[PDB]
């Protein structure tokens, strides 16, 4: 992944 992509959970 791009390091600046979403690093958080998908609810």
């Amino acid at each position: 992944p791009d390091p600046n992509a979403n690093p958080n959970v998908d609810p």
Epitope: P7, N8, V9
Partner: antibody
């Protein structure tokens, strides 16, 4: 109230090791990516490492690649930075920072929002 | 590495003045620019995200504008709690910061 505190800093000689930890409060730790950021004596800020929410991906700055490891214990809600082969240039205050707390997915690039209190690391012969 | 540059490095101002700080980027970062505030001895605080969006509870005396390579933080009326060092940060390719702009008290 989203709040964080880094600890574990100290004074080591070049080439030795040090482990930093970060405690959190007021948010669900296992749901957000975490950063380590440091601030050099010249008040300059530089990013160190990022870890995904589930620990599936870790990215490091070129200065610390191979010597530093970022990790997390999503059950104890703790962020870790293990350092070995420390250099004098690593002398800084190390902060932990949460990635921007959006759980929507609308954006394509993500930064940081909440920074914890820093811990001081001094590397000198 | 996308290089960030701020101007000025030090800014003398008085309470109630309109203060403007500029941030320049070596490459077009679209609107992925953030403004942080850091008071001495404390950790930075996020004030403005996505170039122009104020965070919750940030006073509306703060404003941000710009896109591409030139960005601007404007404080419409400097209050005593606004004397600090302000950093900009791009979050397009990794995360890099400006050197900081110190807002001091003019006497």
């Amino acid at each position: 109230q989203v709040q964080m505190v880094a600890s574990g800093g100290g004074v080591v000689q070049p080439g030795r090791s040090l482990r930093l930890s970060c405690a959190v409060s007021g948010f669900t730790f296992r749901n957000f990516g975490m950063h380590w950021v440091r601030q050099d004596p010249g008040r300059g800020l530089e990013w160190v490492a990022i870890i995904w929410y589930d620990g599936s991906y870790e990215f490091y700055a070129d200065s610390v690649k191979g010597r530093f490891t970022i990790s997390r214990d999503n059950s104890k809600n703790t962020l870790y930075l293990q350092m070995n082969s420390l250099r004098a240039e690593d002398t800084a205050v190390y902060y932990c920072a949460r990635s921007y707390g959006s759980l929507t997915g609308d954006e394509t690039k993500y930064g940081m929002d909440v920074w914890g209190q820093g811990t001081t690391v001094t590397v000198s012969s | 590495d996308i290089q960030m540059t701020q101007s000025p490095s030090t800014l003398s101002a008085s309470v109630g003045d309109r203060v403007t700080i500029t941030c320049r980027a070596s490459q077009s970062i679209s609107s992925w620019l953030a403004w942080f505030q850091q008071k001495p001895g404390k950790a930075p605080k996020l004030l403005i995200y996505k170039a122009s969006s104020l965070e919750s509870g940030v006073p509306s005396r703060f404003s941000g504008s710009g896109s591409g390579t030139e960005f601007t933080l404007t404080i419409s009326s400097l209050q005593p709690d606004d004397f600090a060092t302000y950093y900009c940060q791009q979050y397009k390719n990794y995360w890099t910061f400006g050197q900081g702009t110190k807002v001091e008290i003019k006497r």
